[PDB]
């Protein structure tokens, strides 16, 4: 894709993950990112929130310890890039 | 002074106009902020100008400078076709604007 | 049909124009509110009228009615001047405006 | 504006309210300022949208006589409204 880039967990806790990305160059900076997280299986839905586009990090709280999750960062549109996801067990 | 403000309002009129095309669905941060900042400046300056100047002359001159900057920028920064029609329309515009300032 | 909502996009252009004059630098609530709301009506009405119509002929007639409506409702409501000279330079300005927008 | 009352007060905060006018008189913002009626230093100030006719003043020292004033955007309306009030 183009943005976002390099989605990693900076810090983690049994219940909470702190994730970060490379927004890219100034001209690639978007107005917001929408961030999805749920059990990497999907017992019912997923959980979702958005973050102002000027932020490269987001904290995800209220997870079940021991469980593998999938965490996806989207751009406003599909014009920019494919939505980069990672798996992480808490 | 009121006239000076109008020119800058017209200037910012085009800077948000061209920044809005360079924003996507209002999605690119930097162009989105520029459009947003250029509109709030454009409106503000216009609103303050309209206190001391006829709305008819304020609007038309504001719109004019925006239309003129739009083509001056269009021609220079986008290789836009420079017609003899386009030049005479920029002359009528300038004559219109200069003219109105001269009957203050 | 999109032509008529382009006409109306153009009437609401004059509405916020006059409402903005009445707001006295955007300080009187209601004329201030009309100015804002009557703006995004104009812009919305446009983007729909423009969907169908040529962007050039759309804006040309949009801002034409905007600029002339302001000039007319001005000399009427705010008893703004009616000089032989002012009516002339306004004509050169609006044709230059209409002109450059009808070329793009 | 007119009719600057203190509708409610606690030792540390006042709820003030005023008469916006009607329709033609409504301004887009009010600017309220409050300070000790005495040694003052500066005054704290804030602004409320002109559609709102109440305001809350918080972080007052209990027992101290404060003065509250409500400005229109410009002079050309109906002057500032001022009151004194001990908390
Ligand atoms: C201020 C008035 O502005 C002028 O009035 C005409 C309004 O009718 C326009 O011509 C219009 O009318 C002609 C028909 O007489 C058409 O051929 C033209 O394409 C069309 O622009 C013309 O450009 C425009 O500057
Ligand atoms: C929505 C954008 C325009 C914002 C302008 C706010 C209106 C108030 C302007 C008052 C400041 C200038 P003053 C003290 C000479 O009236
Ligand atoms: N609607 C317009 N004619 N112009 C405009 C430009 C900038 C801010 C708000 C509105």
Numbering used by the authors:
A (entry chain C): 3 to 92
B (entry chain B), C (entry chain A): 1 to 104
D (entry chain D): 6 to 92
Question: Could you share sentences copied from the article?
Answer:
The two 4-TM helix subunits of Gdx-Clo are arranged antiparallel with respect to each other in non-equivalent “A” and “B” conformations. Transport by the antiparallel SMR proteins involves a conformational swap between the two structurally distinct monomers, which seals the substrate binding site on one side of the membrane while opening an identical site on the opposite side.
In order to visualize substrate coordination, we solved a structure of the Gdx-Clo/L10 monobody complex together with a non-natural transported substrate, phenylGdm+, since this compound’s bulky phenyl group would aid modeling of the substrate. The substrate’s guanidinyl group is coordinated by E13B, whose position is in turn stabilized by a stack of conserved H-bond donors and acceptors, including W62B, S42B, and W16B. The guanidinyl group of phenylGdm+ is also in close proximity to the opposite E13A sidechain. However, E13A is deflected downward by a cross-subunit interaction with Y59B, so that the angle between the nitrogen, hydrogen (coplanar with the guanidinyl group), and oxygen atoms is not optimal for H-bond formation. Based on our Gdx-Clo structure, we propose that Y59B and the guanidinium group compete for E13A, and that displacement of Y59B by the guanidinyl group initiates the transport motion. It is also notable that E13 only forms a single hydrogen bond with the Gdm+ ion.
